[PDB]
Write a protein that binds this DNA or RNA. Structure first.
Ligand SMILES: [Zn+2]
Length: 87
RNA sequence: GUUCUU
């Protein structure tokens, strides 16, 4: 039974490859607004889970952003609305 | 492939 809340003004970014970095994602997403955070999710040992979230200070149309074809280092980012489920 | 993280 579907869970979580849709986070406003935030985009899920999956398919983040080890050859990529936060800075190029940050710089790209500035085309849509003032980026608040590029937050890559890691495990407890600091190992990337290969996805993260880009949030904005301004209102963005997430539906439109997730249509974008954004490639880095030979790989296409996998975009979606950001959903937050329940140290 | 949906977030502990001022
Ligand atoms: Zn903590």
């Amino acid at each position: 039974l579907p869970e979580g809340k849709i986070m406003p003004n935030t985009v899920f970014v999956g398919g983040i490859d080890v050859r990529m970095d936060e800075t190029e994602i940050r710089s790209f997403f500035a085309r849509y607004g003032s980026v608040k955070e590029v937050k890559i999710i890691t495990d407890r040992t600091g190992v990337s889970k290969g996805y993260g979230f880009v949030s904005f200070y301004n209102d963005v149309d997430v539906q439109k952003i997730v249509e974008s074809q954004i490639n880095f280092h030979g790989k296409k980012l996998k975009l979606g609305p950001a959903i937050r489920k329940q140290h």
